[PDB]
Amino acid sequence: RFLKVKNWETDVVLTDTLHLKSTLETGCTEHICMGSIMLPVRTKDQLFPLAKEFLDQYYSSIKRFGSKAHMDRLEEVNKEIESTSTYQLKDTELIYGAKHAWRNASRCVGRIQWSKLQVFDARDCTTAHGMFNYICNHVKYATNKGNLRSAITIFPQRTDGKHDFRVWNSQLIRYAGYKQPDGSTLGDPANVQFTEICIQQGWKAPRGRFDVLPLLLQANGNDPELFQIPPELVLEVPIRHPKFDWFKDLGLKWYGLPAVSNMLLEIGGLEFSACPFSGWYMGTEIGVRDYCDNSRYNILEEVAKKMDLDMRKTSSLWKDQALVEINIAVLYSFQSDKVTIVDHHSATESFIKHMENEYRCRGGCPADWVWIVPPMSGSITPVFHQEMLNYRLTPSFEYQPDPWNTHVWKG
Amino acid sequence: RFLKVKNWETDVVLTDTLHLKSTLETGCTEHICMGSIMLPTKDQLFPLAKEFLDQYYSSIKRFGSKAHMDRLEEVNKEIESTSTYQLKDTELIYGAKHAWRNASRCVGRIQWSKLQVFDARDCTTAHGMFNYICNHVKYATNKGNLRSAITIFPQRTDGKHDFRVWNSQLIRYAGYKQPDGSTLGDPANVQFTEICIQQGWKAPRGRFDVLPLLLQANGNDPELFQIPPELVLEVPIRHPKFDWFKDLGLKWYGLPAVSNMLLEIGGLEFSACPFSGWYMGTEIGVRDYCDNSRYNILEEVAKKMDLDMRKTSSLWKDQALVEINIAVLYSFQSDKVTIVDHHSATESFIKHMENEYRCRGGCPADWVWIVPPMSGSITPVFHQEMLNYRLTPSFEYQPDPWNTHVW
Ligand code: HEM
Ligand code: HEM
Ligand SMILES: C[C@H](O)[C@H](O)[C@H]1CNc2nc(N)[nH]c(=O)c2N1
Ligand SMILES: C[C@H](O)[C@H](O)[C@H]1CNc2nc(N)[nH]c(=O)c2N1
Ligand SMILES: CCSCCC(=N)NCCC[C@H](N)C(=O)O
Ligand SMILES: CCSCCC(=N)NCCC[C@H](N)C(=O)O
Ligand SMILES: [Zn+2]
Where does the chain bind heme b (chain A)? Predict the structure, then answer.
C-alpha cells in the first residue's frame, strides 16, 4: 500500500512506503487520534526476531544482504542468544544503530544531520565514577569551544533489569530549581523535584537563579552517586539584545550544550537505558519555552514592562511582541559568542529538504507535526504547511520512567 | 477504554469517557497517525435516526418516555415508506448546535449553544437561496456586533437534487492570474473565480473584489448573484503606531461564513448549510496576509519597517508578523467589528474544555488546528493534551461541486 502527503503551500505530494516497515504502535486507533498526547526483561523467543530484523537492515545498508558474512553473523547471534540469553553488538552495528535511532526520531527537527554523529562506546564502563569520566569527555568533545558537535555516549545495556545503568538527570546540563516556603520558585521550576533529590543525596546548593546541577549517576543497578561537572567544561552565554541595552540587566544566561540524558536507545531488541546524546539548540527552545512558559523562567512580564508596551489588554499583542525581542536576543547572544545555534526559519527549511530527500531515497520520513512545528510563528515556517505521517521505526529512542520511581534502594 | 488528558502547564488531568460514543473514523491506525493530514439506504438510515433521536430525548430528560418511543416509531414508519424522514424544528436546532459542539477543529465552541438557526428547508430556487443568504449575512453582521448563525437548505434526497453553495465562504475576494506571471488578489480563489467568469460574471479585476454567489438549487445548474455591496461590511487596515501602514491598501471583510461544508444530522445530509461566527485575528493577519500562497505581504511590510532582511536570524519575518496582526485587531476594534485575539480565544476554549469534561465526559479537539498559527506555546492550548474523535451530528467536508455536477 502507498500513503500520500501534501504540502499545502507548494502542492508537492510525496508518497510514503516506509510506513510498511513499522511494527511498534502509536496510541491511535481508527476511532481515536492521540497525536497530541505527550507520553502515549525480554525472552529469547522475542529477542531473535528483533535481532534478525535489525541485522537484515544493517547488512542491506552495507550492500551485503545474504552474503556469507550476513549469514554467519545471524548464526553467531542466534547461538549467543540461546546460550547467554542476550547478545553483544559489534562496534559497526552500534554506530549504525545509534545513527538510525536519530534518523527515526519523529519529534526531532534537526535530522538533516543524522549521519554526522560521534558515537562514544562506553560499554566497558562499570562504575559511577567511570560514567562520570565518560560524561565529562562527551561534554568536552561536544562543546568544542562553541563549535558544537553531535555526540552520543553509550553505557552497557540492560541485562536482567536489576543492573541498569541510568543517568538520573534529564539533561547533562540543567539549572537547579528551589521551591520556597512562600510558594515562589527560585531558578528553573521544571527541575525542582530532581533538585530535591540531589540535595537529599548531599549536594550543597548555592541557591541562585542559574546553578548548574550535579550529575547523579547509577551504574550496574547500584545506588546513584553525585558528581560535579567541572565548571570550565560548562560553556554558558550571557543573554543581551542588539538594540536594547537594558536587556543584559535582566540577569539572563543559558548553557550552550543541550544533552538529553533520560531516554532509552533500543537497537536489535537490546535496551541501552543510559545513552546521553546532544546536538545544538534551536533558538526557540530557550527564548520561547525555557524563558517564556509560565511553568519555567516566565519572563514575559518583566521584558514587556521594560519595553513599556500596553499591558492592560492582551489584544495589543504585548506578549507576542516581547516574545520576538527575547528570541532575537538569544540568537544574537549565541552568535556573538560564537556558540552554535540555529533559528527556527533555517532549521525548519533544512528539515523540509531533509524530509523530501528521505522520501526519495528511503520511501518516507516519520514526523510528529505537533513537535516539529516551532512554538512561535508556526505558519511562517514551511513545516506548518507540510502534512506528515507519524509511525515508529527501530532502532529508536524511547521514553522510560524516571529512575527514582523504580529504583530499589540498597543503602 | 477510559482515557486521561493532561495539561502540562497546570498539571490538571481530565478523564475522557465521551470517546466511547465515538461513531465515525479518524484516519489513524495503531501503526500510523494521520493527525496532521487536512482531509484524511433504508438499512443504513434507521440506526442513524435512532442513535440521534435517543440522544435528543436524553438531552431533554425524556429518555424511554412515550413521547420518545412514539417519535422513534413515527420516523421508522416514515423511512420504511418514504426512504427518508423529516426533522422537527426542535431536532433541527439541536442537531445544528451539536454539529458545532462536536466540531473538533473549532476553537470558538464555548459559544455553541448560542446559535441562531435559520430553517430554509422550504427553499426551492437559487433566487430563494440568494434571499435567505442576504438575510443571514445582514442578521449575523448586525452592523458589526456579530451574531453566530447557520442557514439550512433542504436535505439530500436521491442525490441528483442537491442544494449547494459553490463558494467556499459567503464572502471572499477574487483571484486572477496575469500575463505578468503573478497573481492579482487572493490566490486561494483563482479556480473558483474562473468558474464565475465562464458562467457569466463580469470581473472588475482588482485586488479585493467580493466574489458573487454561485448557487445551486434542487440539483439544477448553479446561478450567479451579487450580494448587495451595502450588506458586505469591510474594514480598512491601519496600525496604531505605523502611519505608513494604510498606504499598503489593505482591507478585509468582517463576516467569516463557511459555506462549503455538509451538515449531517441523524443520517440526513444537508449539503448547503452556510454558517458564520466571528474572526480570530490571526486568521486574517497570519494566514490570509502572510501565507506565501495567499496575499504574501511579509516582504513589503518588512521593507517599510526598515528591518535587516539580510539574514533569517534577525527574526524580521517574526517582527513584521506581530505588527501585521496588531494592525488587524486594532482596525476591527476601531470600526467596532467583533474580532477575538488568539490569547482570549484559546483561554475561552480551555474553560469550555473543562465545562465539557465536567458536564459531558469530554470534548473532541484537534490540537493541530486549535493551536494558533503564531505564538503557539504562549497560548494555554499549546500545553493541553487533546483527544480527537468524530461525533455526530457533524460538519463534514464534501467534494467541490464542479467536480461532481453534470450540467
Ligand atoms: C544537530 C542538532 C539538532 C537539532 C537542531 C535538533 C532539534 C531538535 C529539537 C528542537 C527538538 C525538540 C526539543 C524539545 O522540544 O524539547 C528535538 C527533539 C529530539 N531530538 Fe533532536 N536535534 C538535533 C540533534 C539530535 C541528536 C544528535 C539526536 C540523537 C542522536 C536527536 C534526537 C532527538 C530526539 C529523540 C528528540 C525527542 C526528545 C523528546 O521527546 O524529549 N537530535 N530535536
Ligand atoms: C463565534 C465565534 C467563532 C470562533 C471565534 C470560531 C473559531 C474557529 C477557528 C479559528 C477555526 C479555524 C478556521 C481556520 O483556520 O480556517 C474554526 C473552524 C471551524 N469552526 Fe468555528 N468559530 C466560531 C463559530 C463557529 C460556528 C457558529 C460554527 C458552526 C455552527 C463553527 C464551526 C466550525 C467548523 C466546522 C470549523 C472547521 C472548518 C474547517 O475545517 O475549515 N464555528 N473555528
Ligand atoms: C500537549 C502537547 O502535546 C505538548 O505541549 C507538546 C506540544 N508540542 C511540543 N513540541 C515540542 N517541540 N516540544 C514540546 O515540549 C511540546 N509539547
Ligand atoms: C498540514 C497541516 O495539517 C495544515 O497546515 C494545517 C495545520 N493547522 C491548521 N490550523 C488551522 N486552524 N487552520 C489550518 O488551515 C491549518 N492547516
Ligand atoms: C538532544 C536531542 S535534540 C538536540 C538538542 C536540542 N536541540 N534539544 C534538546 C532538548 C533541549 C530542551 N528543549 C531545552 O530547551 O533545554
Ligand atoms: C464559520 C465557522 S468558524 C467561525 C468563523 C471563523 N472565525 N473563521 C472561518 C474560517 C475563515 C478563514 N480561516 C479566513 O481567514 O477567511
Ligand atoms: Zn493519530
Answer: 108, 399
Q: Which residues of B are catalytic?
A: 106, 109, 278, 283
CA-proximal residue: ligand 3, atom 13 (nearest): A371
Is residue A213, in this structure, part of any structural domain at all? yes
B378 touches chain A (CB under 8 A): yes
Asked if A292 lies within 8 A of B37 by C-beta distance, the reply is no
Q: Note whether A32 and A63 are same-domain residues.
A: yes
Residue nearest to atom 14 of ligand 3 (CA): A371
Identify the CATH number of the domain in which residue B48 sits.
3.90.340.10
Please check whether residue A321 touches B, CB under 8 A. Answer: yes
Q: How much helix, strand and coil, in percent to the nearest 5, is found in chain B?
A: 40, 15, 45
Pick from A35, A315, A380: CB nearest B367: A35
Catalytic hit among A80, A285, A356, A387: A285
Same domain, A43 and A87: yes
Quick one: A191 and A77 in the same domain? no
Q: What's the Cα-to-Cα distance from B117 to each of A145, A154, A244, B114, B151, rounded to whole Å?
A: 66, 63, 53, 9, 6
Residue B299 counted as domain residue: yes
Looking up cell 521550576, which residue turns up? A189
Which of these, B220, B213, B41, lies nearest to B136 by C-alpha position? Answer: B213
Beta-carbon pairs below 8 A across chains A and B: 206
Q: Helices B89-101 and B42-59 meet at what angle, rounded to 10?
A: 90
Give CA–CA dist B58/B67, Å, rounded. 12
Using an 8 Å Cβ cutoff, are A283 and A99 in contact? no
Q: Which of residues 69-128 of A touch B (CB under 8 A)?
A: none
Which element (helix H / strand E) includes B177?
Answer: strand B175-177
Q: How many domains does chain B have?
A: 3
User: B361 and B351 in one domain?
Assistant: yes
Nearest one of A74, A76, A18, A69 to A50, comparing CA atoms: A74
Instruction: Tell me: do B62 and B75 sit in the same domain.
Output: yes
- The method recorded for this entry reads X-ray
Quick one: DSSP state of residue B323? H
In angstroms, what CA-CA distances link A139 with A180, A276, B221? Answer: 31, 10, 71
Contact A370 B367 (CB under 8 A): yes
B321 shares its domain with B350: no
Question: How far is the C-alpha of A257 from the C-alpha of B243, rounded, in Å?
Answer: 44
Q: Same structural domain for residues B34 and B58?
A: yes
Q: Is the CB of B283 under 6 A from ligand 6?
A: yes
Same domain, A176 and A298: no
Assess whether A111 carries a catalytic annotation.
Answer: yes
CB contact under 8 A, B343 and A319: yes
Domain annotation covers residue A385: no
SS3 per residue for chain A: CCEEEEECCCCCEEEECHHHHCCCCCCCCCCCECCCCCCCCCCHHHHHHHHHHHHHHHHHHCCCCCCHHHHHHHHHHHHHHHHHCCCCCCHHHHHHHHHHHHHCCCCCCCHHHCCCCEEEECCCCCCHHHHHHHHHHHHHHHHHHHCCCCEEEECCCCCCCCCCCEECCCECCCECEEECCCCCEEECHHHHHHHHHHHHHCCCCCCCCCCECCEEEECCCCCCEEECCCHHHCCEEECCCCCCCCHHHHCCEEECCCEECCCEEEECCEEECCCCEECCEEHHHHHHHHHHCCCCCCCHHHHHHHCCCCCCCHHHCHHHHHHHHHHHHHHHHHHHCCCCEECHHHHHHHHHHHHHHHHHHHCCCCCCHHHHCCCCCHHHCHHHHECCCECCCCCEEECCCCHHHHCCCCC
Q: Which residue of B has its CA nearest to A345?
A: B312
The active-site residue, picked from A108, A125, A198, A275, is A108
